Amino acid sequence: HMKAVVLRSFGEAGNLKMETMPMPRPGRGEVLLRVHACGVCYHDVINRRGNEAAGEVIEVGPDTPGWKTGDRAATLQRMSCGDCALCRSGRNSLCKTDNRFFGEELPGGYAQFMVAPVGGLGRVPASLPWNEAATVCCTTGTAVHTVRTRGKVRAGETVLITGASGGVGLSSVQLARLDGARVIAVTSSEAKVQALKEAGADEVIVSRGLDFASDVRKRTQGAGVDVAVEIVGSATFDQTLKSMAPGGRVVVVGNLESGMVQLNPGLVIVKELEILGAYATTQAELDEALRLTATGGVRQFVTDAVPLAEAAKAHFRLENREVAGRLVLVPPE
């Protein structure tokens, strides 16, 4: 047997039912994990309507060479098949052969136990506390795919980050600076200014999302930034494109839920801007994200740890924007 939180009917935050469930058994090329912590990012609130954890390896399944008992591991969000045309090409976030996503087709991490294939796990260094390790893939893990893999930030470039207050934002500020770039952060609240500074931001602009283009210009000596991390949800797109320098790059990341944004094709044309989608974290990207966390080059900002039984209270605090940071669910022993 095994204790877990289950959702059988979409709707309200209180529908997350603590059902006693059976323990899963790993198949060929799979492993059983004892969940020590599991983060709640707003994508789960989206899944709570109709539209990220870490633990110890206790039982290894057949055809699992690299892994043993007691090994530390953290899970991605999207499973990725091995050898397709896009995987061998490095475009693992677009594979359709194995589109399995944790918390959906594969049992989520709201359980004391869970199984995961080999390719969907990243080794967690021994230095990492479990709470912080469970919030890496959807913060720093997304930062690696956005800042490095897709955006390809280079030392000597200036990066704009809209909606910089958040899991992906604060990790993108750190990583972009760690790779030798200057960081201009845009936030909506004065309170989030000091955090962005402590995270390494060279400039922090407080804007509702319709007036910062000029300030980003004055701060770049009229040149404009080379890269933009567009974290949708703040109504900032028009000002972002105007903040770009000629040939600048805009890497779009965020949730599907946010409405359509204001696009002026003229700006893209005459400035030859590159708007790039950035989606899923790769196993290699997660391994790097976990290292950068152990290293100290990219921190985590855990607001509070919550018992797994209180999963309904977690989604409520996250639904009403009554939290600043990333909450974690700890299953009982």
Q: Which stretch binds a second copy (CB under 8 A): 7-15, 85-93, 122-130, 291-299?
A: 85-93
Least CB distance to Zn ion at residue 116 (A): 15
Cβ(249)–Cβ(224) below 8 Å: no
Contact letters (x/-) for Zn ion, 70-109, by CB under 5 A? -----------x--x--x-------x-x------------
Token digits for 261?
Answer: 């944004």
The answer to whether the annotation marks 41 as part of a ligand binding site is yes
Tokens describing residue 126: 């021994």
Closest CA to 308 of 114, 66, 35: 35
Radius of gyration of the chain (CA): 20
Residue 2 in contact with Zn ion, rule: CB under 5 A = no
H-helix segments, 80-129: none
93 binds a second copy (CB under 8 A): yes
Q: Which strand (E) or helix (H) includes residue 309?
A: none
Is residue 192 within 8 A of residue 219, CB to CB? The reply is no
What whole-number distance in Å separates Cα of residue 167 and Cα of residue 298? 11
Which residues, in sequence order, are CB contacts of 194 under 8 Å at separation 6+? none
250 in contact with Zn ion (CB under 5 A): no
Between 65 and 156, whose beta carbon lies closer to a second copy? 156
Residue 66: exposure state from Cβ atoms within 10 A (0-12, 13-18, ≥19): exposed
- Name which of residues 212 to 251 contact a second copy (CB under 8 A): 230, 232-234, 237, 246-247
**Which residues, numbered 173-212, are part of the site for Zn ion (CB under 5 A)?**
none
Query: Which option in Zn ion, a second copy, none does residue 45 bind, with CB closer than 5 to 8 A by kind?
Result: none
Q: Site mask, a second copy, residues 129-168, x = CB under 8 A?
A: ---------------------x------------------
In angstroms, give the least distance from the CB of 104 to Zn ion: 11
Alpha-carbon dihedral sign for residues 325, 293, 232, 120: negative
Minimum distance of Zn ion from residue 5's CB (angstroms): 15
Per CB under 5 A, the list member of 36, 43, 48, 177 interacting with Zn ion is: 43
Q: How far is the CB of 326 from a second copy (least distance, A)?
A: 20
Between CA 193 and CA 205 the distance in angstroms is 8
Residue 137 known to bind ligand:
no
- Please say which residue, 243 or 300, places its beta carbon nearer to a second copy: 243
Which of 71, 179, 202, 274: binder of a second copy (CB under 8 A)?
A: 274
Query: How is residue 97 written in tokens?
Result: 């052969």
The token pair that represents 24 in the structure block: 């899963």
Task: Using alpha carbons only, give the angle 46, 48, 54 rounded to the nearest 5 degrees.
Answer: 85
Query: How far is 170 from 291, CA to CA, in rounded Å?
Result: 17
Render 157-191 in DSSP notation, one character per residue.
-EEEEET-SSHHHHHHHHHHHHTT-EEEEEES-ST
Ranges within 257-316 binding Zn ion (CB under 5 A): none
Q: Which is nearer to a second copy, 193 or 276 (CB)?
A: 276
The smaller minimum CB distance to a second copy, of residues 97 and 194, is found at: 97
Chosen from a second copy, Zn ion, none, partner binding at 41 (C-beta under 5 to 8 Å by type) = Zn ion
For binding to Zn ion (CB under 5 A), which residues are involved? 41, 43, 52, 81, 84, 87, 95, 97, 138
Binding site listing for Zn(2+): 41, 81, 84, 87, 95, 138
For binding to a second copy (CB under 8 A), which residues are involved? 86, 91, 93-94, 96, 150, 230, 232-234, 237, 246-247, 252-258, 260-266, 268-279
